[PDB]
Amino acid sequence: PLVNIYNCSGVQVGDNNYLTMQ
Amino acid sequence: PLVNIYNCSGVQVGDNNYLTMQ
Amino acid sequence: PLVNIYNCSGVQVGDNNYLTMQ
């Protein structure tokens, strides 16, 4: 359920097409 | 379900066309 | 379903044309 991330870059709950960045 | 992210950058629940940033 | 993000930058549920930023 709740995550409360407040990050500062790439993230994903988790599913198809895994993210990237640079 | 609920996520409650409050992040400060790129983020995907998770699906096709995985995100990018710079 | 519900996400309740309240972030402060780029984000996407997840689909085609993965986002960018700078």
Swiss-Prot record, chains A, B, C:
Subunit and partners: Interacts (via RIP homotypic interaction motif) with RIPK1 (via RIP homotypic interaction motif); this interaction induces RIPK1 phosphorylation and formation of a RIPK1-RIPK3 necrosis-inducing complex. Interacts with MLKL; the interaction is direct and triggers necroptosis. Interacts with ZBP1 (via RIP homotypic interaction motif); interaction with ZBP1 activates RIPK3, triggering necroptosis. Upon TNF-induced necrosis, the RIPK1-RIPK3 dimer further interacts with PGAM5 and MLKL; the formation of this complex leads to PGAM5 phosphorylation and increase in PGAM5 phosphatase activity.
Motif annotated as RIP homotypic interaction motif (RHIM), chain positions: 3-19
Free-text note on domains in this protein's UniProt record: The RIP homotypic interaction motif/RHIM mediates interaction with the RHIM motif of RIPK1. Both motifs form a hetero-amyloid serpentine fold, stabilized by hydrophobic packing and featuring an unusual Cys-Ser ladder of alternating Ser (from RIPK1) and Cys (from RIPK3).
Tissues expressed in: Highly expressed in the pancreas. Detected at lower levels in heart, placenta, lung and kidney.
Post-translational modification: (Microbial infection) Proteolytically cleaved by S.flexneri OspD3 within the RIP homotypic interaction motif (RHIM), leading to its degradation and inhibition of necroptosis.
Protein name: Receptor-interacting serine/threonine-protein kinase 3
Family the entry assigns: Belongs to the protein kinase superfamily. TKL Ser/Thr protein kinase family.
Portion held of the full protein: 448 to 469 of 518
Gene source species: Homo sapiens (Human)
Protein function: Serine/threonine-protein kinase that activates necroptosis and apoptosis, two parallel forms of cell death. Necroptosis, a programmed cell death process in response to death-inducing TNF-alpha family members, is triggered by RIPK3 following activation by ZBP1. Activated RIPK3 forms a necrosis-inducing complex and mediates phosphorylation of MLKL, promoting MLKL localization to the plasma membrane and execution of programmed necrosis characterized by calcium influx and plasma membrane damage. (Microbial infection) In case of herpes simplex virus 1/HHV-1 infection, forms heteromeric amyloid structures with HHV-1 protein RIR1/ICP6 which may inhibit RIPK3-mediated necroptosis, thereby preventing host cell death pathway and allowing viral evasion.
Localization: Cytoplasm, Cytosol; Nucleus
